[PDB]
Amino acid sequence: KKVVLGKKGDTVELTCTASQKKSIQFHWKNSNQIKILGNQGSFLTKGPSKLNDRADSRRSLWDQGNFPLIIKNLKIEDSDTYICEVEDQKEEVQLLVFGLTANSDTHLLQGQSLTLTLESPPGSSPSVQCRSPRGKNIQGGKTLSVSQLELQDSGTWTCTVLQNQKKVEFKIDIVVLAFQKASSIVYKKEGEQVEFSFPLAFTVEKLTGSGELWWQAERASSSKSWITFDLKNKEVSVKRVTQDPKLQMGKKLPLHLTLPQALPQYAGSGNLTLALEAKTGKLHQEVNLVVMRATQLQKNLTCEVWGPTSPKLMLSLKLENKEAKVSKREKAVWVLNPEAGMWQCLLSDSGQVLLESNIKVLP
Predict the structure, then answer these.
(1) Among 273, 291, 309, where does a domain finish?
(2) Interior CA angle at 170 toward 168 and 174, to 5°?
(3) Beta-sheet strand order (sheet of 355-360)
(4) Could you tell me where this protein is found in the cell?
(5) Which residue range is the domain that position 334 belongs to?
């Protein structure tokens, strides 16, 4: 019969009319033959039933035949078969509520799984199709959880509680805090003052955050090299550590890991781990630095690219004027015997020029 679904605490309207359309007697009673609410002229009445003061009917719409049932603050335990005994007939209506919910709530950063458990009348079965704000028609049973949340899954989802030839949609909001970059990469040359940047997405909250950046310098296994920082609102500050190079950091939230001069030994990978709280987790975002050193020995020259280079790239040295004085696939090429010209060292991959470092020859 009439199988209408509802949401917890939401409300729903049970229909009930008939021919004759005039203000006549009517009475809503649940399968337990208890009278939800009834009438006696304009005077609207209710029953002893648990539903009592949360049920209501529209007296205005009464004149036009409707003897509607409005249930406010939907209690899960409202799931029943109500009957609207109007002028010589009975209307059977089963109202099955539901309630989609995530327990892992407040301040979700990356990865940290999301879980969606469901409430439903003891004896009926749902199915949930959680459509994401972007793609993935993730679906499951009385429960379905999103694995490790990746940025783009931030927003407003739309899970659907299917039950019967009826279905009830649900709008849950899920925002993934995180970095706006995976592997940042900077290509510089022996000297060029290096800068790095990893942004977030504003937020407030109390006593909330600090971590540090770790670096794997090329060859220099001499690790444990780092910089530590504490954050609070639009305030950042180095906890301590740095040492080794003169890395300077900002006072302002949009973090700028600064590297005074791009010296050759400062090339390699790095992980900048951020970890705040309320209900913690730890963000990560990769960092990498490459260096190029164009320097003529004596009357003969050479140049080299250190750091995270690809076994797909090429290096080349030419005097600009004419074409390839030496082309190759490695990080330490040489050009013995150069001629006057403002020479260009080139690091790339495929075609688009990565690193370019100019230098002149004398005779």
Answers:
(1) 291
(2) 165
(3) 326-328, 315-318, 342-347, 355-360
(4) Cell membrane
(5) 292-363
